[PDB]
Symmetry: C2
Subunit: 439 residues, 2 copies
């Protein structure tokens, strides 16, 4: 019945050593690689408790009575329970209520109430929070009233006297039913984003594991790419598919974008991974945007030169410039620095790269891309992110470098932890030596 | 430079024969398999025109002035343009406005206005519809008002006199800003679900292609499973990873669920694909829930026996019962049948299988799971889906068969087109011979 014969009743992360358990997670492949790498495993119970305590405190601090979550990523933060995450993202069938006294209720898919029972912090498993046309047709409104009354009763019993209810995102039928029950609806994302921005110690351990699994997956992809780019039939999709499979093999969950592109399709950036047949002596650039092991997002970007010739000198300069961009901007990071000061003091890209530079120079990361967004000075809005960095924040540091009308771009990105007195770059993946001008 | 040297200026679906184009789509591998299989390809231009005309007409019929879409799946329907779909599903950065005169505008990611330029029906590419805390922090409200005013001006110019604006789903700041501009917000999903439910000729062609690619990919996964299950290390995730890769290799897009499970993890159903090490002489059941080539959803389910020994007799019976369930229910399908009569006349499962039967016996499908939902008699809600089937609808037909406390379940499902005179089962994938009671 054990999935790992070499261990006792529990796995290294404290979960049941049971091949037949309901709960999923990292595979034996991932665990094996992490152990060989000397990575400490998170304790999931302590992690779940940390997140829950923190989210409750956030509600209390704002003087709210509760927080109601329909975003699958917020539900994942609150409960660590998944259920058809990707379907859930555009079908709001699921909901979690967390009250000011810490009492937490989930409304799950009717047929699957068992999916969150591994987490005892989830005190109740209900159903009927699915308020959208596919699931209920012309009778959404009736159930919206049933649900909103349930939320009223829960709030009466667990947040008496509170009328402020924070909601991340809710269908209009739901919004109106809640307001009909006398709730003042507050901005749920302001609560969830600032809570999720600070990782506890187990989250950081989990993230270290996911990063390692991601870098392993990327290394398989680079091996495949260098092995058969230019063979006349290997597509962008063929290469990218390796990342998909190696992620899933290690217990990863999905990939957020299609940001892999070859040759002239790298400029302008944001062209999507497709059928293009790759060529010898061309750039390939990509962004992992990966929801990986333990559901942790690993967001890094690399640019490869593949071929028998040397890359052009303008390619080497661009690569070196981008690398300088993220290493300079990274060095600004430490606790107490104000986010708009990052914007104001950031490394200056050459004029010819300014037009097509990235949408931010940094952003938060956790279970996916997260607050804060650190804009370049010409896009930054005063009063949008007037907050200081704190230990436990994790920021991805970005560079997109390419000219208007040019035939290539560089994309680089590392994932960086804020520590007690500075920063630690979590990303160890190599930079292409030819593009760096070192080979 | 051509991606397919055997063709002229265009590919079989009318798109440019250009290896370097922005637009993505099916790979040469997919096109090659479809040509081998005898499949007529969709014409994408005609398909895009059919959807747009139909969506515009839907607005006109209801007496609305416009329809505003933040669901990436509805955006896909209206424009056929993708952009970080999965990120978009839980980060509403994107919007499409379609007015009563057919005028259509997209607000896209700031850095990527070019992604919808291939569709001349999209008349403008703007930015600034991203109304959520990650993207704008404490200054969502300012841009919400800028966006809402833009919508007002467009509606004044292209739907003068109309104050009814259908919206599928929008963040509260956006909702408030639009209402402040005088709009009465109508249920957008009621419009999009009913429009999307009838597929044009080209959408049916695209779906035939997607179905074949999906079945091909599943064939690879079956090969992998039968060759490796029970080798002491092959996990659920290992098997499932094959479907991911093979889908991506054919220009597919993502998978909506984690519904693949082995052995006792199939009962109860909806346990998720994970690290479980698979065993010889065991059931593996799965649900593709796949967003495939041309962005079309293929939603089929099969159950497999892998082992030396024979399946148990109760397994074989359950499989037969399940297969009987869907084939009987499928026979109800033809134009003019009222959905609640599908419910009332459905095949009855044995008492022992009733408690855990699926959440529906049928549902629509197109770009993903869509309206209608056909519930079993004990869950159906009167007045929820009082509409007749029509030619061009596509419905998946479902069976979940398992006992309370049982150690396996059967899951079967086929994807069926409604024709002028009846139905056409689009799904050709075989049923497990041993489970069916053959040899
Ligand atoms: Fe990214
Ligand atoms: Fe990033
Ligand atoms: Fe399904
Ligand atoms: Fe289905």
């Amino acid at each position: 019945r054990k999935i790992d014969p070499s261990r006792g009743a529990t796995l290294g992360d404290g979960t049941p050593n049971d091949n037949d358990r309901i709960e999923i997670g990292p595979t034996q492949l991932a665990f094996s690689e992490w152990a060989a790498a000397g990575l400490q495993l998170p304790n999931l119970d302590r992690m779940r408790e940390y997140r829950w305590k923190r989210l409750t405190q956030a509600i209390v601090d704002r003087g709210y009575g509760g927080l109601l979550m329909f975003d699958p990523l917020n539900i994942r933060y609150a409960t660590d329970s998944t259920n058809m995450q990707l379907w859930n993202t555009h079908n709001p069938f699921r909901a979690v209520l967390l009250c000011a006294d810490g009492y937490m209720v989930i409304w799950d898919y009717k047929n699957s109430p068992f999916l969150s029972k591994f987490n005892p912090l989830v005190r109740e498993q209900r159903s009927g929070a699915d308020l959208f046309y596919f699931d209920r047709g012309d009778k959404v409104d009736v159930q919206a009233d049933v649900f909103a009354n349930e939320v009223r009763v829960l709030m009466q019993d667990h947040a008496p006297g509170h009328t402020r209810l924070a909601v991340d995102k809710i269908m209009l039928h739901g919004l109106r039913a809640l307001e009909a029950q006398g709730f003042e609806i507050m901005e749920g994302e302001e609560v969830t984003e600032k809570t999720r921005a600070i990782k506890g110690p187990d989250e950081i351990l989990a993230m270290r594991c996911a990063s390692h699994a991601c870098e392993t997956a990327v290394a398989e992809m680079e091996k495949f790419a260098r092995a058969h780019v230019g063979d006349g039939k290997t597509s962008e999709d063929d290469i990218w598919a390796v990342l998909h499979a190696e992620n899933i093999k290690r217990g990863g969950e999905w990939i957020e974008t299609r940001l892999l592109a070859s040759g002239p399709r790298t400029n302008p950036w944001f062209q999507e991974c497709g059928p293009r047949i790759t060529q010898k002596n061309e750039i390939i650039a990509f962004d992992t945007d990966l929801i990986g092991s333990y559901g942790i997002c690993v967001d890094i970007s690399r640019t490869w030169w593949i071929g028998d010739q040397k890359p052009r000198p303008d390619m080497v300069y661009a690569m070196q410039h981008a690398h300088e961009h993220i290493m300079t901007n990274m060095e600004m990071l430490k606790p107490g620095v104000m986010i708009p000061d990052l914007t104001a003091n950031c490394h200056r890209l050459d004029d010819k790269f300014q037009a097509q530079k990235y949408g931010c120079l940094m952003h938060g990361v956790g279970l996916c891309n997260e607050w804060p967004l650190v804009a370049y000075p010409d896009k930054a809005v005063p009063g949008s992110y007037d907050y200081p960095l704190e230990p436990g924040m994790v920021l991805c540091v970005e560079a997109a470098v390419g000219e208007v009308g040019g035939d290539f771009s560089i994309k680089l990105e590392d994932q960086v932890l804020i520590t007690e007195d500075g920063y630690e770059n979590l990303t160890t993946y190599p930079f292409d030596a030819a593009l760096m001008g070192l080979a």
